[PDB]
Symmetry: D2
Subunit: 30 residues, 4 copies
């Protein structure tokens, strides 16, 4: 499953991009 | 147990203040 | 001229979009 | 005169701390 996370993905995930949500920038992680 | 959340606390929680974590500001929620 | 500004454009400018710069989200103002 | 800047102070300035302004964190520079 994919999630938006700050500041980085958790171990086992890969960052595919970035999310813009609630006026902040997140890692897009799957 | 408290948490840092963006942009707001969840139901069940009261906001006590703000967190500064990973270069972002978060609601500090318990 | 166009600028990235937080949290909003200044009087006389119009927001055309958003900038991603230095891990924050800005108004794109011209 | 001090200023709030993202992501860092400019030349001529010393960072004294951090600003919390408009939901973002800034370098506090004089
Ligand atoms: Cl991998
Ligand atoms: Cl931010
Ligand atoms: Cl917040
Ligand atoms: Cl206009
Ligand atoms: Cl900073």
């Amino acid at each position: 499953a994919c999630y938006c996370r700050i500041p980085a993905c958790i171990a086992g995930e890969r960052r595919y991009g970035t999310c813009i949500y609630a006026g902040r920038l997140w890692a897009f992680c799957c």
